[PDB]
Structures are given as structure tokens and as C-alpha cells.
Design a protein around this ligand. Structure first.
Ligand SMILES: O=C(O)[C@@H](O)[C@H](O)[C@H](O)COP(=O)(O)O
Ligand SMILES: O=C(O)[C@@H](O)[C@H](O)[C@H](O)COP(=O)(O)O
Lengths: 190, 190
């Protein structure tokens, strides 16, 4: 058998860039049907179509017991009142967990069960977040600078984006009167 | 079914302390039969019996797909010429991986296959280390201050300390003439 080669990689905690990893880019135009204010979404796409987030991932062959890791740089912004976020997903193998480490900026995680119950966990540098089996998860940038974090997750966890793409999360994170709010999603189908 | 509660915990990157986690302490006297210079080991135990390392672990019920994480504070020191290190272990389920994130200080990882081939990966703050399936792993502090890191690993990986307790690693990390060396272990049985 081949024993895979151990390695180290440099991660820059100031930029989130993983040396040699290769950036994946999600622009606002890649996120139709995600934000509550659909007209605000369309206008910002027309005017700018900004980068919402970038991901640097180091991934193994899909195998039980193995581990992937990735950084994300989630840029600051709003679509209407709603802060920039990641698409969010369940695992394909639902019972897989994740562990996140916040590195820079100010943000948080929205989590949701298949039944639709949602939780918010605030994230500042040094916060480690336990993403349990069976929960979907989305990260949100509530500040004025990039929100940067590292995620470690099973190599065989896979992705279910579709469920979230259709239903969204049951809570949204917005700014009103200069204050950040977590509130029920008015468009939540269930 | 119960969906486990998501949570965040504060990790202090300067001290490695995980809030609320509860310290496990490994003193030099807990490591008989680990260092090459057995007389140097015995003398330092008699004179001081220093703390070699402390671990703060956040662990789940042993279940496929779930994740544990832990910090270690590996203190600076030598037993003779040999730098302080962790005991080191294989997983009980051998094909489980780990991911480490170096936070503070200067150190590195020694890895070894069941066949006895060994690898060294240098670790400074920001270095992420991929610990592959089937490898044993030990961390080493090659500097003058605590070496602090975070590890994420499968909840069902388990521990095999016994193999390492009897055979050691095939390489040692020492200081000679003010320079750090990685060299063959003269006492390596195989
Ligand atoms: O481990 C993870 O889930 C992350 O690396 C995310 O994939 C990343 O933050 C981007 O979010 P999403 O995959 O939901 O678009
Ligand atoms: O994930 C790990 O393996 C670490 O948390 C180690 O357990 C820790 O560094 C202590 O080393 P050992 O378990 O080999 O005594």
C-alpha cells in the first residue's frame, strides 16, 4: 500500500491565502435566489457584481476517516440590509461534522437542522466552532473588513447545496438602525 | 433524534488555553522509556520532574464522521540532547487522519508508518500540517518558549500508544553544537 505523503503548508492568517492551493471565487451573480431582497441583488449585480467570497481548499480522495481543510475570505457587503454570506449547505453524508477556526474580522455562523431549527454562533478571532452532525451551515460577515476562517471537515462528507438553494435558512442576519440583528426569515418556506 | 447543540469556544492563541476545557498534564515521570538517554531522564525526574506538555481537549461521543479538537502546550526543554516531545501514537482505527494548526513557538512533527519510515515537518505559526491515514505522529519543541498548536481529528480514531511506547520513533530530534538535528535513532528496534 501507499502511505500518503505528510506535508505542511503556510497559511497567512492576515489574508487567508493557503500557499499553492488555487482560489475558487463566488461572485454575487453566482447566488441568484439566495438573498431576501431580490431587486437589491439584481441591482448590485448590474452595478458591480462584487466578489462575495473566495475559498482555498486542500482536499483528499473521498475516503472514510480522512480530512479536508479550507480557508475562506468572506468579503464585507450587504444586499439591501442583508450581510454577505456563503451559499450554505448540508453534507451529502449528513452525519459528518466540521470544525471552524476564526482568524480575522467579525462574523458568525448560521446553522440549521433538517427540521428547520436554526442557531447563530458569533465568531471573532480565536473562536473555534463545532458544526455538529446533521446541521447545515452558512457563514456571515457582519463587519467592514474581510472575515477570514479555516475549516476542517471529513473527506467523504460531500455537499448538498440544493436544499438550501431552494428553501434558504429560517433566519437572516441584517443591519437596521446601525445595529446587527438576527431575525426570522420572512420568506422561509416550511 | 437529538440534534447536538452547536457551540463556539474561545481559544487563546497566546496561551493555548481552551475556555472551560480542563487541562490534562503529562510530566516527565509519565514518560519512562521514551527518551534515548535514560540516565538523563532519571536525573531530570529526580531534580525537577517538569511538565512536558498540557492538553485541552473537546471531544464527542465516539462515532463515525464526527470530530474532536484539542490544543497542546508543549514546554521547552531537553532530556540530554533530545528536545521535549509528546508521547506519540497511532490511531486505533489506523486509516484516520488529523489536521494540525501551529499557533505559537517553534517546533515540528515527526511521523512514522507501520513499516518504520519517518518524516519531519517543520512547524511555525500559521503552518497547517496534514497527518495522513496510517501514520503515527509526535510533536517536538525545538525552541526556548512554549510550542502551542491546535489539532482536529476524527471522534472514532482512538489511540495506540503502546506500539510507540515499546519501539519509539526511527528518528530523534536533538541539539548538538547549538544546531538542531534530525538523525537516526540509535536505539530503533527493527
Ligand atoms: O468547510 C466548509 O464548509 C467551507 O470551506 C465552505 O465550503 C466555504 O466557507 C464556502 O461556503 P459554501 O461551501 O457553503 O459555499
Ligand atoms: O490530536 C492529537 O493527537 C493531539 O491532541 C495529541 O493527543 C496531543 O498533542 C498530545 O500528544 P499524545 O497524545 O501523543 O501524548
Amino acid at each position: 500500500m501507499m502511505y500518503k505523503e505528510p506535508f505542511g503548508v503556510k497559511v497567512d492568517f492576515e489574508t487567508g491565502i493557503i500557499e499553492g492551493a488555487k482560489k475558487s471565487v463566488r461572485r454575487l451573480s453566482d447566488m441568484e435566489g439566495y438573498f431576501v431582497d431580490e431587486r437589491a441583488w439584481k441591482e448590485l449585480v448590474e452595478k458591480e457584481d462584487p466578489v462575495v467570497y473566495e475559498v482555498y481548499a486542500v482536499e483528499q480522495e473521498e475516503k472514510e476517516g480522512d480530512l479536508n481543510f479550507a480557508t475562506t475570505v468572506l468579503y464585507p457587503g450587504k444586499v439591501g440590509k442583508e450581510f454577505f454570506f456563503t451559499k450554505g449547505h448540508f453534507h451529502a453524508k449528513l452525519d459528518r461534522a466540521e470544525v471552524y477556526v476564526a482568524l480575522k474580522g467579525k462574523g458568525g455562523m448560521l446553522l440549521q437542522t433538517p427540521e428547520g431549527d436554526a442557531k447563530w454562533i458569533s465568531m471573532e478571532p480565536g473562536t473555534v466552532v463545532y458544526v455538529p452532525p446533521y446541521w447545515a451551515h452558512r457563514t456571515v460577515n457582519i463587519g467592514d473588513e474581510p472575515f477570514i476562517f479555516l475549516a476542517i471537515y471529513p473527506a467523504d462528507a460531500g455537499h448538498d447545496y440544493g436544499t438550501i438553494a431552494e428553501k434558504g435558512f429560517s433566519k437572516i442576519v441584517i443591519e437596521e438602525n446601525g445595529e446587527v440583528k438576527v431575525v426570522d426569515n420572512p420568506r422561509w418556506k416550511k
